[PDB]
Amino acid sequence: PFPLFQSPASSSELESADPDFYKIGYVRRVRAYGVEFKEGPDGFGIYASKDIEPRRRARVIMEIPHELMITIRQKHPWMFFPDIVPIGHPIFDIINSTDPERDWDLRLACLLLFSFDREDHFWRLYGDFLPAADECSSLLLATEEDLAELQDPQLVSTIRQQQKRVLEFWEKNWHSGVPLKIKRLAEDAERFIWAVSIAQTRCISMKTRIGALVQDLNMMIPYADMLNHSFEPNCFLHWRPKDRILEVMSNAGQAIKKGEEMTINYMPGQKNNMLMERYGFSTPVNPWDAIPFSGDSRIHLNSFLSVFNIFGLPEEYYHDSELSGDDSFVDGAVIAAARTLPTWSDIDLPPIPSAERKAVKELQDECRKMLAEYPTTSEQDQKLLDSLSEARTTFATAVKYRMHRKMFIGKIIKALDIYQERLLF
Amino acid sequence: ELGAGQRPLPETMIALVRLSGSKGNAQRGLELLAAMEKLNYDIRQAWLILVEELVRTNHLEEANKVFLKGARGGMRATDQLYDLMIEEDCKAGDHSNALDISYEMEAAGRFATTFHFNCLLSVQATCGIP
């Protein structure tokens, strides 16, 4: 059992990030504790370097000083903290000539381009680790080929509406008569589209106390956007006001195993269409995805909730792991079914299994129709992705969005199937 | 059901405590809630219904015992329950329990708005000490 006798000497897609990535932040008083940055074909990501033994309170994971971020108030007037825009600079007129509630992304894009031009700004170095125009997964960069494949008239209309708004803003504020200090920020219309895409896909709104002032800031925190999204996060963002440090803290009393990814929820609860519009990604396990349904047929959700060990109020629906034992089927996807499915419930009225069985097939009779509405199948799309070897990443996300929606329909079909038979016991 | 030897369904457990709350049997209600925790279930959601039922059946004094005991545990009640429970106590002249409940709400992550203070003032204005 001696170390000499013991001879210790997968996950190939994930490689350790460039050491300079953490080093350029480390010199700026950025500390990451027990975690390391790994990159792959999907992108960056923070993965634990060791087992995180749970404590009484939340454990500090990362610290980001304020001076490394780009922050702008959500509400007029537009004041920038770690103030980088000089007084009288023409870029402020562009920022100030924006919609107070619709053009939050545009105001961040102007600051983002302005920061890249500044020589002393930290983001001119951190900008090299941002995804390029092709690598970014934002739908704002997608063309009609990916949008048509997306198969969502509502989502496509919104995306094409944003593209016109962003492009026309660049045309108005980047004509031939602008000063060179403004022209060099966006030499072509395409770059400004990429700037807005980064702003939309990486803004982190938060109420922070800077000194004696409390306000809501559309922040651009570095090293913290790299955290991926999950509706059941293992860590959250906490702003420490005394030293202007943004703390990334793992949930209190939760153990993180070696190599586990650290994730935060970008939005509290939203549907995949909102995530595609904002961040350009979708999750099949979204507990907030809905689906239109006729109200004629309904079931007893209390029986449905209990059979999958789902407890709490609808605002706090969650699944219990130890009660179910293993239950590999139950996930966040079926939790959304508890909300989007038409249901009925009285004080304590037990349901009629035959009537529900009469309706479960009738419910599933409708469920096969939506899958038939989409010409492709859930497995057909993912098979295409594996076969696909040369395409834009927005095309893959558009495939994933319709695949996740189709699986969400596929998941509930199985969910009603197991629910129907389990109702007998 | 216990004699047969299988775990009762949560819906059955929820119906039990609600029935106890309808008759105001506080001792029975808390005993069943302890069983759920011993059965490793979500006591909080059932605990809300039992407290509401006691208030519904005008068993306010018993409701204070159940609500406070859950409040000291750490579970957070709904916004409606805090508003309902505080207002009933102040209508019944139970500022001592209402103030204690309000403190538990503050520790629960919800801050007393103007509505909650108005309920407390309705009783303090009659104490004779401005």
Place this chain on the structure above:
Amino acid sequence: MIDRYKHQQLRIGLVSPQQISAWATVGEVTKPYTFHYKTNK
């Protein structure tokens, strides 16, 4: 945020002769004496 209320009134005032008697309840003093010179009593 509910302040932890702590009301402590500290009143002062003239005392009625009855309450003076209440302090001595019987504590009537008549002899202008003290410890005895010899017996120390």
